[PDB]
């Protein structure tokens, strides 16, 4: 809102807070990113190291769908189970059944191994799996199976 702005407070004061010596001219220093390798080099080097130059190779017609593989950690693996069934498993009212989790159905392609796992068998169907995640599932007593 205009009534909360500082221009209202600058009414009656010549130069509107822009100074008398420097006068708020049009574009001192240039427009946009002018002088990146010149008078603005000090800023462009203090911040944004690496602004200029090329690194790496090109990929013509990159289709982002080729690289779709969202990952989930084993610490949040059990959060994919519905809360009531998850509580039943964690408290131990099954111990004769195992949950089969479809990471692709939940929207994930790779299983990573960040967290810990409770000592409960569980079958995990994933496109990809990390070595640590696989090891941790096996030690918990389950198995991971590749499904594409």
């Amino acid at each position: 809102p205009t009534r909360f702005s500082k221009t209202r407070k600058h009414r009656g004061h010549v130069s509107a807070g822009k100074g008398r010596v420097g006068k708020h001219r049009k574009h001192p220093g240039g427009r946009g990113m002018a002088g990146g390798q010149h008078h603005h080099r000090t800023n462009l080097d203090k911040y944004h190291p690496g602004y200029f130059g090329k690194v790496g190779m090109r990929h013509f017609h990159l289709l982002r769908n080729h690289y779709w593989r969202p990952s989930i950690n084993i610490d949040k693996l059990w959060s994919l189970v519905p809360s009531d069934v998850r509580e039943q498993y964690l408290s131990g009212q099954k111990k004769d059944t195992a949950p089969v989790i479809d990471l692709l159905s939940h929207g994930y392609a790779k299983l990573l191994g960040k967290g810990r796992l409770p000592e409960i068998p569980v079958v995990v169907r994933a496109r990809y799996v990390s070595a640590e995640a696989e090891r941790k599932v096996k030690e918990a007593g389950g198995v991971v199976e590749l499904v594409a």
């Binding site: 009656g12 004061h13 010549v14 008398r20």
Partner: protein
């Protein structure tokens, strides 16, 4: 009669006239702070107009108090003047300028009943 109060001191009665408003008709006499770089009034040269300051502020006990010791309360009707029922020794009713003559008479009668001073009763 108003409540007992300390004597009213104003610290100043003049109006703080705007600089050069006495010489230029385009300038209203209402105070304006001079922002000029060379302004003698702003720089506080001897023998010049004084600028208003918080040091001129009136005593907190007697602020907003007319010489009789009452504070003005603007009233537009009898119900407005009845708000001063418990304040006839501290507040005086001032009838609004746009009040008709009959309503003014009614307000004056009610204020007389309540013992409330009216600043502009005569008409």
């Amino acid at each position: 009669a108003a409540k007992k109060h300390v004597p009213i001191v104003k610290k100043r009665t003049k109006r703080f006239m705007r600089h050069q408003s006495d010489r230029f008709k385009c300038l209203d006499s209402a105070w304006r702070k001079p922002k000029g770089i060379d302004n003698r009034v702003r720089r506080r040269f001897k023998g010049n107009l004084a600028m208003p300051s918080i040091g001129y502020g009136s005593n907190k006990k007697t602020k907003h108090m007319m010489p009789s010791g009452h504070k003005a309360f603007l009233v537009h009707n009898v119900k407005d003047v009845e708000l001063l029922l418990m304040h006839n020794r501290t507040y005086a009713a001032e009838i609004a300028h746009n009040v008709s003559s009959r309503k003014r008479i009614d307000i004056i009668t009610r204020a007389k009943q309540l013992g409330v001073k009216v600043t502009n009763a005569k008409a």
